[model samples]
Target: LVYEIDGTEALGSCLRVRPCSNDAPDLSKCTIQWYRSSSDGSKKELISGATKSVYAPEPFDVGRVLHADIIYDGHSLSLSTVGKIDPAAGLGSYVEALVRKHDVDFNVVVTQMSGEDHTSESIHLFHVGKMRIKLCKGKTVIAKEYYSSAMQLCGVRGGGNAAAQALYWQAKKGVSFVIAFESERERNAAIMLARRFACDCNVTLAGPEDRT
Candidate 1:
């Protein structure tokens, strides 16, 4: 029997296995099995009822290898073992941590302007959802003095001399910002902020790869 296994190594990702034969035999007659292994591939345990063509990983699946076994006509065939799935994998984790610590969300914002143009001259104003934003630069601020809705402790402005000429609207070159969230409220807040600022940005759940 010919078979293949495919999936992601990220903690929250999914995996799939498919079996095929030279004669295009019926897959219904075949038996499917799944296994989990340690880092060294020496220890393994069968995952009960993992007989389907698709598998959704659990939290404990992190930092372990996965295997798919297929048996047909009294012959056993197993695909190559997949690499370990990491719980801390992807950029999402980085952004999530940032939001959890402070009221202001200061993450990376993608911009069309070159690095040279990404300076304070480009920023006009900021907001969170429908609420306006206030920034404090080189000054100590009280909780009451900060913009309560979209507080980003680390203030980020726009870029370029052209930005100044355009009323601090430098991101208009069609650049996008990358934002992360741990909850629906945070996601909606980011979307509203992007629309209010007229900035192109993507709001997504946090992952390890999200870290700069």
Candidate 2:
């Protein structure tokens, strides 16, 4: 009975103890329990009545750990998902019409790779969460590409410094979309607020925020 968690450990999201297969001869023979804990690893408290395969994260579980214990086909598996839960309280829906759209307003320079070069566009809006950033144009959403874990906002290089309010979003491979703030007065607050939440994320695409 092998299993894995199929969702991010953020509030407003659902984690499923997805098994290798859904074909079970006896549904009654399967049992699953969800557990929440501090990062201590030694702390595990059962979430009673959460016997199903799906578990929606709650605000109480933010910044902690979550796991699932399942027994099926005479085997047991304790599925531990990714790192600590992102403190994205109330970040459940990304619809632009709701509260998330107005969470934090800002301007950024968005660039994407072109055929042989790259093109950049500016978006005025955006909201911030523990791990997600979003921008939408009507029905098409073109955001949520940058994530930092325990990460800090770094000033951009070359033309970005010396009184510039621009910052660079570093990535391991290639294609880093540099972010330009509205202005110094606006960016300082934005950067500080972003740093606080980013640091609180505790986890992101990779290592701690200081790396890149």
Candidate 3:
């Protein structure tokens, strides 16, 4: 917080938050309410008893945005977990990708060949299951990272052998493999976003100053 949601939005995921203020909060002494809403902020429904700084995405909460209102020390602020998740973000960093971890994961929404380039061919060629990428449309939304469980920031890049369409191959890398996105836009956004996370974690970014 500065009002944020800091986790993936997949079904059964945690969209936890920090106190909106840097001042320590004894949350038990404050009121915390979370809700689900249309991504555009409509049809708000309280997630009964969800009164903590952390809220788990209900199984049915895949597509809806999340919000919360809190009161502490004579102050009130309504926050939409539909905000930002910057470990390095400052106060008032408008939550651009709250619902999706949008940039980092690049919600391309492919079901093993849902896009124009034929994800089937790409997924099979790259062995997506082995590469550790899972997809979803409604019942559940995108992403799965089974290749490893470490939170350590690793490397990533777009533009691959082209033999398998394109690859968001994490350079030299962490569980590296072929990764085909719907298009170049989806491909690179994740690369740079991963780069952002790299810095946020104090890992110097790997540059393509001398592209192979």
Candidate 4:
């Protein structure tokens, strides 16, 4: 979902952070926190046990556009409302929608048929019903996993190196996909380390031009 803001303005919105399991745990018991950071910050959190959704609007939040939540499933983040402002322009509004997870099963049906002639040309796909179809390869499935809460992923060493450590920790915990840095070099370096230490998963690189 897209949200537009024209000029200097403030807005507010809400998102219901559902629990990953009602019977397994109580919704109230689930601790929630909000964050704002770059892809590196997010990757650090992923390693340390932070929620995937980066822009979780804090209560009393202002000048912010999106509100993200870790659902009851504890695996995915549901973002709502996107906010932006154009200086010297007028005030505008933003919106957020469920980042649609691609359906790999459906895509695979077609991929298998079209790329039959080439070896290793087959694409891997994921089709978590209702969730976004993220990484697509051949026969590699990265199912979503749950976390107890949205905490910053940290390492035993702590401090500046914590984020990097956290990434490895999160990978060890079975995180499949990672949001990579916009820069090709930085992203490649991170992914290479992640693959060596964590799970060999696909990285989703988001740039200014990406629609999602």
Candidate 5:
């Protein structure tokens, strides 16, 4: 049998496995089993029906050795050990640290635009602090401006010298966009916003950082 299994230790990440055999075993007749073993040599079968080619480990799966058992062709084979999920060695810990430091809320609004042949979805707007960033999927923005002017387009208008004061502070203390790196489109949006605002904007993965 030909198979592959891999995953990171990140708390929210997934581990996936694919199984194949040169004998072209009937998949319908095949059953896949995943087991978690602790250091004490105790083993427990994971939830039933996880007989697919992919599996996402839960919090309980951390620090445990994982393996898979395959039944096919009226025979069974034990695949090689997958690996252990270590929380401290993964990006999850880094993201958690950033979240505690930033203390900011992030949100996105997705809209579907229907076309004659296809429908495209995009994050129409992203909110961080008093800023609302507009984005179009794929392409970089054609126009660029500072945060103050960008805020005006979002219908936030400051009166008198307040607008000038806000702009001054923003430039003096840089702002950052805290974006998750799960999708290319989201990263593009963050980069576009960062470039548009020039030196005043910093782009980071997962969570924002305070202005230094």
Candidate 6:
């Protein structure tokens, strides 16, 4: 599967397969196909090949298929989207279409790596949420999480500066994750700032608690 790093243009760090089998064979034998499937289970192929390592980017919003590309010969296929999908509703079928071309279970990594540590957290304490890692085009946030109602909380909190206030506004605005720091002094200062703004932001301070 293609692993995207910070959305910028039609670029991403590509990983050919998912649930990477330590025993998988070489990639030369693989043939990649790009397509989009409808709700009735019918799929339309947009591009398919093994030699053209880089297929020209498809025209924007040409069809229901937003983006489609895959790597079968150790090369990358890049596709661009001209539309948006909300993960807050359902897994937007088109987004799933973009992910399916890679012939790997990308969702498995989300379940395994991101969910492993939430085992002991209580149900009420853990809020289900979705994180949208948007591509910032010189500071403009591009909405990339193409699923409706895409939210799954990691059982963490937000604090500091207007941090608590910002977190409060974001929570009410339906924010999914937070960007924070590792230094205790800085974090504590943030918490103080949050309190000053009277933000009811709840968060868990990670790392050593006895350092103070």
As for lDDT, the candidate ahead, 3 or 5, is 3
Q: Which ranges of candidate 4 are over 4 A from the true structure?
A: 1-123, 126-128, 131-136, 144-172, 179-212
Against the reference, the lDDT scores of all candidates come to 0.41, 0.52, 0.43, 0.26, 0.38, 0.26
Query: For candidate 5, lDDT tens digit of each residue in 64-111?
Result: 766767777667777634457554343444334433432222233321
TM-score, per-candidate, Cα-based = 0.39, 0.39, 0.35, 0.20, 0.39, 0.20
Best by lDDT: 2
Residue range with the least summed lDDT across 10 consecutive positions in model 2? 203-212
How many residue pairs clash in each candidate at the backbone level? 20, 1, 4, 31, 0, 25
Task: Give the per-residue lDDT digits (tens) of candidate 4, residues 148-207.
Answer: 222112211111111221111132233423321222222223322222222212332221
Give the Å shift of residue 208 in candidate 6.
Answer: 59
Q: Per-residue CA lDDT of candidate 2, range 1-212, in tens?
A: 45678876664456776656667434357788777775456777775445667765543456778888888878777887687777543233322233333357666654322112235454646455555555553456654544553232343322312224544444333434345566543444444445445545654332112222
| Candidate 5, superposed: residue stretches over 4 Å from native | 1-20, 26-29, 80-83, 86-92, 98-212
lDDT of model 3 at position 14: 54
Give the residue spans of candidate 6 off by over 4 A.
Answer: 1-19, 37-42, 46-57, 60-212
Model 6 Cα lDDT, one tens digit per residue, 1-212: 34221121221111122214544334345444434233343544343221222221111112333344545457665443333211222213433443333221111001111213222211111111222223222334422332122222111122212221111112222333332223222222232232222222233211111110
Q: For candidate 3, give the lDDT.
A: 0.43
The TM-score measured for candidate 6 stands at: 0.20
